[PDB]
Amino acid sequence: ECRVLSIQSHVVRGYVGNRAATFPLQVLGFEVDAVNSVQFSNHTGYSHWKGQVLNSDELQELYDGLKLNHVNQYDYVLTGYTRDKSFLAMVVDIVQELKQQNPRLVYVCDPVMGDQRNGEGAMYVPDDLLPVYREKVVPVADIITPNQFEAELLTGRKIHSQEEALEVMDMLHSMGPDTVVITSSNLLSPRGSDYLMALGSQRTRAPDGSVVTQRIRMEMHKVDAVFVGTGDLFAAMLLAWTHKHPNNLKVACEKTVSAMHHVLQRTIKCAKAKSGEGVKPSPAQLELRMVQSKKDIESPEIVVQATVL
Amino acid sequence: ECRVLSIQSHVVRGYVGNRAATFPLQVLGFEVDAVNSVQFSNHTGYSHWKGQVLNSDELQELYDGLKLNHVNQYDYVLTGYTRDKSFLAMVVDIVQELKQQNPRLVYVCDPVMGDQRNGEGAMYVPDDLLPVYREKVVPVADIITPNQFEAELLTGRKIHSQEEALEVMDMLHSMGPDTVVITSSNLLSPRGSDYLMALGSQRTRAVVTQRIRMEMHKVDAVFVGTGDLFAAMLLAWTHKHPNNLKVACEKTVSAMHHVLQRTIKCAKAKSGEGVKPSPAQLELRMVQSKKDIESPEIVVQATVL
Numbered sequence: 353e354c355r356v357l358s359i360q361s362h363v364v365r366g367y368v369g370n371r372a373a374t375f376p377l378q379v380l381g382f383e384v385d386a387v388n389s390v391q392f393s394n395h396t397g398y399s400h401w402k403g404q405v406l407n408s409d410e411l412q413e414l415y416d417g418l419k420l421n422h423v424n425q426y427d428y429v430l431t432g433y434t435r436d437k438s439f440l441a442m443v444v445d446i447v448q449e450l451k452q453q454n455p456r457l458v459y460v461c462d463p464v465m466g467d468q469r470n471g472e473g474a475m476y477v478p479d480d481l482l483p484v485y486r487e488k489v490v491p492v493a494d495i496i497t498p499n500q501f502e503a504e505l506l507t508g509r510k511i512h513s514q515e516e517a518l519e520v521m522d523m524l525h526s527m528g529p530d531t532v533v534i535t536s537s538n539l540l541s542p543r544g545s546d547y548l549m550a551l552g553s554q555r556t557r558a559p560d561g562s563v564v565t566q567r568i569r570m571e572m573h574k575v576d577a578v579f580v581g582t583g584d585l586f587a588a589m590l591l592a593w594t595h596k597h598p599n600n601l602k603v604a605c606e607k608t609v610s611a612m613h614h615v616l617q618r619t620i621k622c623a624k625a626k627s628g629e630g631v632k633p634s635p636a637q638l639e640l641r642m643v644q645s646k647k648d649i650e651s652p653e654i655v656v657q658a659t660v661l
Numbered sequence: 662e663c664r665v666l667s668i669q670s671h672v673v674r675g676y677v678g679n680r681a682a683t684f685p686l687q688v689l690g691f692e693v694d695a696v697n698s699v700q701f702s703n704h705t706g707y708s709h710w711k712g713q714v715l716n717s718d719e720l721q722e723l724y725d726g727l728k729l730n731h732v733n734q735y736d737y738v739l740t741g742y743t744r745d746k747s748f749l750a751m752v753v754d755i756v757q758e759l760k761q762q763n764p765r766l767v768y769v770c771d772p773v774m775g776d777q778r779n780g781e782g783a784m785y786v787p788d789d790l791l792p793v794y795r796e797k798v799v800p801v802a803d804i805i806t807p808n809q810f811e812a813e814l815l816t817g818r819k820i821h822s823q824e825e826a827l828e829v830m831d832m833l834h835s836m837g838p839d840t841v842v843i844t845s846s847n848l849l850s851p852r853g854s855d856y857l858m859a860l861g862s863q864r865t866r867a868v869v870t871q872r873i874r875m876e877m878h879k880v881d882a883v884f885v886g887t888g889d890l891f892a893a894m895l896l897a898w899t900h901k902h903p904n905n906l907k908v909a910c911e912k913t914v915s916a917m918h919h920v921l922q923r924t925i926k927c928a929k930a931k932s933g934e935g936v937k938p939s940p941a942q943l944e945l946r947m948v949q950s951k952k953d954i955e956s957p958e959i960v961v962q963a964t965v966l
């Protein structure tokens with residue numbers, strides 16, 4: 353019996369935030385309680401979008417309702433994109449209260465702030481969120497899934513190589529989370545320029561005070577398209593697989609990355625078919641084919657091997 | 662590839678409204694766009710509840726977003742509990758607009774009315790909603806899932822026997838919906854007093870008519886969201902068996918039985934011995950009934966009337 357409290361955005365159509373995360377965890381057997389931080393018609397990749405947002409006060413209201421009914425017991429808390437600092441600070445109060453009641457609670461956090469869109473690096477959020485992520489969110493997180501840019505920002509250090517990447521991940525471990533996964537980087541991969549390189553690290557303190565650190569590298573073949581909600585889907589499946597393989601980051605990452613590959617291959621195939629030959633698929637046509645990937649999400653065939661570093 | 666627009670309530674914890682309908686439809690292979698009419702912490706069966714309600718203007722603002730992006734093309738529309746007549750009217754406008762764009766669109770409606778436990782923080786459904794359902798909603802609905810009390814209100818008639826029911830169901834057809842299903846009645850099953858009787862009727866312009874009856878053994882507990890789970894699965898099964906309401910209902914009702922059995926068993930297991938299960942312990946074991954929803958073992962035989 354595992355219950356997850358997921359606080360993320362919601363869209364009527366498409367897959368992003370809680371939409372990208374709920375279905376996967378449900379088919380994997382987790383009980384998901386979903387707080388929708390906002391409700392829009394579709395993601396911001398489209399030309400238009402309309403919806404409402406929740407302020408930190410409304411969030412607190414929803415939590416008080418769970419608390420008043422004595423059902424505020426969770427095994428996992430999962431958060432992603434957040435645009436306002438009050439909301440984020442409010443989330444930390446919540447995570448801390450819950451951890452006070454369940455020391456075994458695991459907080460999976462995807463510190464969303466930006467990327468380097470093919471050599472294009474800029475922020476998605478107000479510069480005032482970074483201090484909150486740095487000083488208040490990271491310290492209580494158990495698993496974080498930043499991309500290169502977010503790892504550089506959290507540590508204030510820049511990554512130019514695989515070696516510096518590992519140092520940055522160590523600095524992150526020192527900030528709190530025992531598990532760190534850099535989901536994507538600008539790093540050149542040894543298998544080819546067309547491969548995306550991911551890196552993972554899981555720290556473990558031994559009884560005698562010694563520290564064991566499992567580090568792994570992953571190389572996935574790039575799909576020529578820009579997807580949305582990919583980081584959310586990743587964080588959600590990583591939570592499920594790390595649960596099953598608690599002390600094996602290797603297998604957890606392999607199962608997670610394999611599933612991504614299957615979902616995306618099914619998505620790019622359907623998008624090109626729906627947009628005609630020659631024509632480039634539109635954001636509407638590139639929405640993740642979540643529902644049709646059920647079997648692949650439940651039991652993915654492994655198609656990527658993690659290299660132990 | 663089918664796409665469903667479901668406009669219902671959302672609750673952080675538990676299953677009612679959209680929470681009871683989405684997972685089921687998704688595992689059955691349907692693309693579900695969900696508009697959450699409200700967002701509460703839990704349903705009204707609990708001692709407390711907090712949340713916010715979405716007004717009709719906000720509902721229009723969302724649908725507009727879908728329109729501007731030319732992605733407002735659906736195959737089904739699914740609605741349930743509403744306590745705002747203003748919101749309900751906006752839903753009818755949205756449906757007629759969608760039906761003009763796709764005449765083949767199917768509107769599945771569960772006209773909720775009464776002192777029902779729900780996910781919109783309400784203690785009752787305003788009496789002033791009845792005339793809205795009667796005149797604006799039902800004429801546009803293709804499949805309706807009223808319970809006996811609701812059917813009686815929509816027709817002004819009162820059901821005292823099995824013949825009386827078929828009589829009301831026919832009236833409902835004439836009002837618009839080609840498929841009607843009275844989900845539960847006070848009617849005494851010949852099978853015993855511990856069985857709940859459900860009646861179903863379906864018209865096909867060959868105009869033909871198929872009527873059915875089902876006995877379901879009562880479960881000694883009070884559940885919330887069952888009406889929502891029913892409508893959602895009926896939607897899926899009617900799609901797979903378009904002209905066979907017998908088979909469609911048999912699978913829907915079977916799935917239901919499996920979910921409730923798994924729910925009552927776990928609830929008693931989690932509560933102390935001789936301790937009555939609390940609403941929180943009675944929340945539907947949805948995620949764990951995945952295989953039973955995808956492929957339910959038939960445990961009921963619908964008799965053709």
Ligand SMILES: Nc1ncnc2c1ncn2[C@@H]1O[C@H](COP(=O)(O)OP(=O)(O)OP(=O)(O)O)[C@@H](O)[C@H]1O
Nearest residue numbers: 467499535536572573574575580581582583586612
């Ligand atoms: N084009 C792609 N080809 C292959 N895998 C991809 C692609 N885009 C995303 N992914 C996969 O999705 C997961 C998350 O990707 P990435 O690290 O780019 O996300 P992100 O920058 O956090 O996402 P977002 O910007 O949408 O929040 C990774 O496991 C990655 O392999």
Ligand SMILES: Nc1ncnc2c1ncn2[C@@H]1O[C@H](COP(=O)(O)OP(=O)(O)OP(=O)(O)O)[C@@H](O)[C@H]1O
Nearest residue numbers: 777808844845877878879880886887888889891917
């Ligand atoms: N105690 C029970 N035992 C067996 N089946 C039940 C029970 N309660 C509900 N159901 C099943 O749930 C479905 C809907 O039942 P019911 O007539 O109570 O719904 P409703 O009035 O639409 O629901 P709601 O409580 O959401 O208003 C039917 O298929 C019915 O058999």
Ligand SMILES: [K+]
Nearest residue numbers: 497498499583
């Ligand atoms: K990420």
Ligand SMILES: [K+]
Nearest residue numbers: 806807808844
């Ligand atoms: K009903």
Ligand SMILES: [Zn+2]
Nearest residue numbers: 462464499583
């Ligand atoms: Zn991201």
Ligand SMILES: [Zn+2]
Nearest residue numbers: 771773808888
């Ligand atoms: Zn009902």
